[PDB]
Design a protein around this nucleic acid. Structure first.
Length: 45
DNA sequence: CCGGTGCCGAGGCCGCTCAATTGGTCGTAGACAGCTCTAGCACCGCTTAAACGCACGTACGCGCTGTCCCCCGCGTTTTAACCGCCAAGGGGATTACTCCCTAGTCTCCAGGCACGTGTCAGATATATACATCCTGTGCATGTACTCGGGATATTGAT
């Protein structure tokens, strides 16, 4: 009745006390900024 | 007899003449600016961990909201003790002067307790299992408020 019954978490807050859904968008962009983007490389910034 | 007129007396003007006030200049000395480490030390950067702060429903009373009845407020009257003004007697706080004396300066001396560090140990935070004292609920009854009538003051007018 469902595609899968063995669905696994992708970094939720079941263990810790962080946000249950996912990281905040500001945090997502802050983490993505750490990538060694090239000088002419496109990004979300 | 009354009235013009000189003489004297007083009021008005103006002006110094002099004695008391207050901003400006000279001057020197202890104390606000300002490095100089230092110094160790709080403050900042960088991590997580836990909980309290926050938001969503949801139950459930305590504030707003509508109707009759008198008790207190409003408004009038007269009148009287008080407020406000005035005036005089006299005491005492004021003002000024000389004389005395202890505050103020600074100097010297020195021993008592502020003040910091170093050591160590027992009083106190903290977690967990135990349990019983205080609290919401329910309910009998009696101390106290109320109404009514008779004492004892308690004021005012002859």
């Amino acid at each position: 009745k469902d595609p899968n019954f063995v669905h696994s978490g992708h970094g939720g807050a079941v263990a810790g006390k962080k946000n249950r859904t996912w990281k905040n968008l500001k945090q997502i962009l802050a983490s993505e900024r750490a990538l060694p983007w090239q000088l002419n490389d496109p990004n979300y910034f």
